[PDB]
Amino acid sequence: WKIPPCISNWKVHINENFAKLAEALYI
Amino acid sequence: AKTVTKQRVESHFDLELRAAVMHDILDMMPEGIKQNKARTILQHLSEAWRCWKANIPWKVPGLPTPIENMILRYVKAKADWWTNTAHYNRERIRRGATVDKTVCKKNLGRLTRLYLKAEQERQHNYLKDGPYITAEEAVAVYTTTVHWLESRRFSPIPFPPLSYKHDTKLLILALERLKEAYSVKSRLNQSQREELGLIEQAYDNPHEALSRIKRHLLTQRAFKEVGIEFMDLYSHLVPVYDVEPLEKITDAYLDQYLWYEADKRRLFPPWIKPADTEPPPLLVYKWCQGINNLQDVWETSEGECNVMLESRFEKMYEKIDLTLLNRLLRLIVDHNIADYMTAKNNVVINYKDMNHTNSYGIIRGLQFASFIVQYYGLVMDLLVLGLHRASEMAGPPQMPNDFLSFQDIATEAAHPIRLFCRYIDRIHIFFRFTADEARDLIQRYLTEHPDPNNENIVGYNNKKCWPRDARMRLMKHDVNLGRAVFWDIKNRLPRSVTTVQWENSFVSVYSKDNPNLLFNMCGFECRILPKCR
Amino acid sequence: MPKPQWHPPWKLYRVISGHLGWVRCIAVEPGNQWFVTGSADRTIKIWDLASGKLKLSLTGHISTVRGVIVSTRSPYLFSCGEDKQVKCWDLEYNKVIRHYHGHLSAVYGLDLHPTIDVLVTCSRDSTARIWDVRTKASVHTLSGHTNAVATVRCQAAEPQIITGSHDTTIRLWDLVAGKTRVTLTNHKKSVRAVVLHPRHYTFASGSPDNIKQWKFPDGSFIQNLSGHNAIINTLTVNSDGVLVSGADNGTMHLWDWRTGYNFQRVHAAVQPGSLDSESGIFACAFDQSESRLLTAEADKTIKVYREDDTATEETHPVSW
Amino acid sequence: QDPSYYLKNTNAETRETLQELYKEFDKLNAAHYSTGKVSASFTSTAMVPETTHEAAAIRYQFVKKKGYVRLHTNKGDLNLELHCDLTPKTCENFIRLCKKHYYDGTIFHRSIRNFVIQGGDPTGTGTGGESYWGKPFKDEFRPNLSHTGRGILSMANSGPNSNRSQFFITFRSCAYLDKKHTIFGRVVGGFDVLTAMENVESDPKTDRPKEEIRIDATTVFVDPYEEADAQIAQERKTQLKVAP
Amino acid sequence: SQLSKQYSSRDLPSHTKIKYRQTTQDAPEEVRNRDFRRELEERERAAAREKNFKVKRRWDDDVVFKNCAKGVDDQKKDKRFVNDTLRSEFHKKFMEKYIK
Amino acid sequence: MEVVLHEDKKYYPTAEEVYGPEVETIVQEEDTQPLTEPIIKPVK
Amino acid sequence: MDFQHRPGGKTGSGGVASSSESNRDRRERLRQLALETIDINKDPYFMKNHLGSYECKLCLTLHNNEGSYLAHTKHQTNLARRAA
Amino acid sequence: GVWRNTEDEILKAAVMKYGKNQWSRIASLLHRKSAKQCKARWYEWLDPSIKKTEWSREEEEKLLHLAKLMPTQWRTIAPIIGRTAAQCLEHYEFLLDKAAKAREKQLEEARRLAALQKRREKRKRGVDYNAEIPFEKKPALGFYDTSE
Ligand SMILES: [Zn+2]
């Protein structure tokens, strides 16, 4: 039940179909 | 005890929220544990709510699970109260029932935070689910654009050369366009004074400014962040973008150069509106006269029907894929120009404590955004009309037509689609049908969408500003014809690019039953009645 | 140790949604035609009992409604909230007609006397207040609790007023003098729910430590119903002897009142789009027919449980 | 359905473009603080919304008290107690060096003039040898039992992720080994032999003695890392007869 | 405190008579003899019962895409309720209405 | 896959998937009767 | 007029300071920030002259501004030379 | 738009003092600098999480692959590979070119000196703690005690 102190600020993957689309456009 | 009045609502709610959390601390903690540390838990709750407001991922790395469940549950309660208050205040603001400056400013801030949360959701969903354009739809769009530009004998726009003839004139026009916004001579601020000083420095030494502009066009592909805010028009909000002034000067020169080159090389066909030739009331008058001067337009003796369709493209700006945009823009201009065009839209949108990378939508705050919108709308006009009717409407490239004229009567009568106009994203199409074509279209629409109980009248919408005699008479045949026409138009546009909705559109039929033709162009509701009827 | 009587188990059969806040309290009209919910949406909704259709929605509260009760002998609806105000609604016009005022903090619950037509409210300022209904006059201010009084119960027999508070204490009060009579300090955590048996002249108190059955009027300790170690927010008892304990973590336990034997553990699911932390029973009530159990779950739902008639004694045997 | 759905009047180079494109183409590990995926997915809309809590994994060398290794080197048989609670990586590296023969038969890595003497590395260059994973494990020095004082046994390294098998007994207090070498524990036996090895003449260029103190044998007087491995093997074999 | 002479404006006498339940308004003497169980089953049964030369093409033949509005059918999808105030259908309709 | 758009983007299971087929799921917005209609009708 | 929505001002204010007062306040705050970072870093080379100038005793170099000494961190080679 | 090293050191000290989200407080220290300029200078060059190393083979392969996939979208490409947009754009151009307290005590002492000077020459409805017990609560008696 230990609670750390609050560190206040006031005080990625890509789908493969993208690649396929780019290849199609080049072709 | 004092009552909880209006000015004492919000803080009191927070006070009550705090007290509830305190009670839920004091019976959750087991036997023993002298250090309750409830102030630290309240600080964690405040930090979690502040991270929810800024769409920041909040995760304490070591934190006990029931305390985390408590914090997430109470933050969801506060967020629900916040969002319902925003909805209710926006309904009261749109109704005009509230005249309050603090309520308006607070609600504008709340809707800005909600919109940026939804926009960050949309950008992450675009990056995770892949492009919605699939493969063959983009290839078909690219091929149709290539065939259209080959058919028009279009000469591509080159790079701005080293010694251009009209570069100083375009720079003067762009600098006057940028100096338009600061003619009030108010108190301004530091950034507006910096922009005005940059405008004066470019005005004094135009050659160095032009060299810097061409260097920026050749070299830079990564740009500074853009600010966003919102105009409250009390019925809807309008996004306003803020750009660094050096990029504003470069984009203004690029906008002037691109529009001059597209007008000189005649890229845009005359149906694309707003053109510079006429004001929009003159556009309304020219549309009415182009309807009136068609061949046998009011003759309904043989069951000929006229159909006027008005609609929009809905989320047109939000669904412009940037790779497809770069491939489409490489067909028109030099590759360095199109790379600047594409890379300008992939920047970071900032508002207070939120930053997100715009990767899917276009940004309308760019100076050259109008050119991209009208070019994408040209592609959508080619998708709607097809290549043959668009080549008939534009005429031959050696002798182009004007806005609402044809080369021949036989070229007019060869297609049902008589007139066409696009006003940025609004679409106005005028069809003329014979009896057999209308019967075949109604038969095909009822084949796909059967309705035996005649419920098509109920969802149909009408212009309520007119009297009952001036409104559209809702016979079954005209309603079925209008729904058939709208279904056939909606089948042409793929939903990945843009869609056309029935609720935002309006289809009017002129027939032997309906003597009036109703439409709404710009801010004008127009009703055409022939002298024969 | 006698064998407990076999109770048939209960099952969820409808889930009603439509509130935009936590449903905090549920009351049932005495003619069993409709029931009523108060929420954190600052709205009070009258729901049909049989069809489940939303009959009416009333606004007027400015904060979260914490307690709603229907008068058995008057056409009045009493609502208390976190806005430090108690409202008496005339159902005859569906409008607020009386404002009981004087609490310094949020009112966490209320109860009606079944015979005298006097009102008792418990609030977060460590006080309960006893109000005459017609004159809106606070005739007593019961004080002596050192923390917020989570719940209050009222009955005709002596003692009239039962208070459970957050300082691990239960106070059995005297109505005519406004003084406490019996103090029970057996609980280790906050007493969040007390419920009174309809006929056995006993009552039970709920805390995260245990559930404790006592004996009126001296408050002598009878039984320690153990298990269900969560923050119990509510407690209701059937006329048939079924005790339902609902917790803040969403788990529901069903007990025989006499032997204290847990015979069913029900952990319902949540709303379709909802976190796992938003599972919690805030209030629950039987109907007048003692056959439908209505719970106000923390995922903005009302969940309704029915008896399972297909089960028999050998299909669900009583352990030990 | 089919790729030619939503496609009428297909062009030529569209058809060879699509043709060319298609021709080309856990029980004891519950650490009770959970993952941060639910809270971050709720507070931000930039992730997939997950609504159910999942407990975070944790083995981190769950051992019993402190180990004690008796190394019989050329100075003699010296016993050193390594605190697994102060540094489990250093005690695990020392146990793996004494177990996988990285320290048994090895030469002295370093030897200073009554400051620190390093052995158990098979290379003998100061930071040689191998850990349990082959590559050198992470190094961290505890504040309760650091690499200071007389006979402080530390997994000798130049910093983090560099301590594999080099065990250095420091005979003097120094801040150079603090937060650079993972301090295992302290020498509990053979203080006279370690003092005679540290007090011998040593070459200061390589910081090593002329006569290398070579560990002839290693014995596990108390093995915390092997007991933790046996407990992990018992926990694995508790659910291995029906999970093959 | 009843020693003061300050009278609040909302402490004036009002609604001095308590309305009681009449015979048709579920007075407790007719509540006590009723059986709510059976009446609840025919009300539930009534609710369940009431619950139920040169030839040319076609004019639209020369387009690029066809039947794009094929699987567009909302129907019961507007009847879904989600307890997430950013992913609710009402909030989505609100954001597409009030932001242009 | 046939790519779902952002406009649909069906997060979460439906209510029949969560609660099963036996549980009747009722979603209720707007009152069936107006506020002028009184609960408990007056005698007249 | 909208008295509760006017820009905020209090009586007996005295107005906004000029460019010279703001410049010397910025210089005093920069001196305070430099002294705070020096005391955090615990560098013994920093000295204040009798005429009030920053001096690096390890480099034996005077500094006109606080950021001149803040950029004086060559100093490693001079510290290695002055170490012996 | 130039950035001296003195301003970079002052910006680093201001970030280490005032945290991250304050920028106008940071830009108060820097003369002829804005808060947006300070934020851009921190997030572009002076952030310690910026990888100021050389590109690996895997980093260059991923950079060339992602530049082939999404053309001229460097604000999207750069968080995938972990570098910034300017560094990855410059490295991609290079790869294509290669391929081609006391005051109150003093006031109290002065008040005591003035009081002694006035003594040598109401109570404001308060409670005098030095005269008697302020709120006298007697201890409970039972089974013992003979006082003192
Ligand atoms: Zn120096």
CSV table of N, CA and C and ligand atoms in Angstrom, one decimal, chain G residues 45 56 58-60 69 72 74-75 78, ligand 1:
chain,number,residue,atom,x,y,z
G,45,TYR,N,35.0,27.4,-8.1
G,45,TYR,CA,35.7,28.3,-9.0
G,45,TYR,C,35.1,29.7,-9.1
G,56,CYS,N,36.5,33.2,-12.5
G,56,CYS,CA,36.8,31.8,-12.5
G,56,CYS,C,38.2,31.7,-12.0
G,58,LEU,N,39.7,28.8,-11.2
G,58,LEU,CA,40.3,27.6,-11.8
G,58,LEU,C,40.8,28.0,-13.2
G,59,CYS,N,40.1,28.9,-13.9
G,59,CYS,CA,40.6,29.4,-15.2
G,59,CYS,C,41.3,30.7,-15.0
G,60,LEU,N,41.1,31.5,-13.9
G,60,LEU,CA,41.5,32.8,-13.7
G,60,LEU,C,41.1,33.8,-14.8
G,69,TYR,N,30.0,33.4,-17.4
G,69,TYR,CA,30.5,32.3,-16.5
G,69,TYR,C,29.7,31.0,-16.6
G,72,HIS,N,31.1,29.1,-19.2
G,72,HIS,CA,32.5,28.7,-18.9
G,72,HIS,C,32.4,27.4,-18.1
G,74,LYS,N,39.3,26.1,-22.6
G,74,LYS,CA,38.2,25.5,-21.9
G,74,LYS,C,38.4,25.5,-20.4
G,75,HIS,N,37.5,25.0,-19.7
G,75,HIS,CA,37.5,24.9,-18.2
G,75,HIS,C,38.0,23.6,-17.7
G,78,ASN,N,41.8,23.6,-18.2
G,78,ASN,CA,42.4,24.5,-17.2
G,78,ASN,C,42.3,23.9,-15.8
I,1,ZN,ZN,36.9,27.9,-15.6
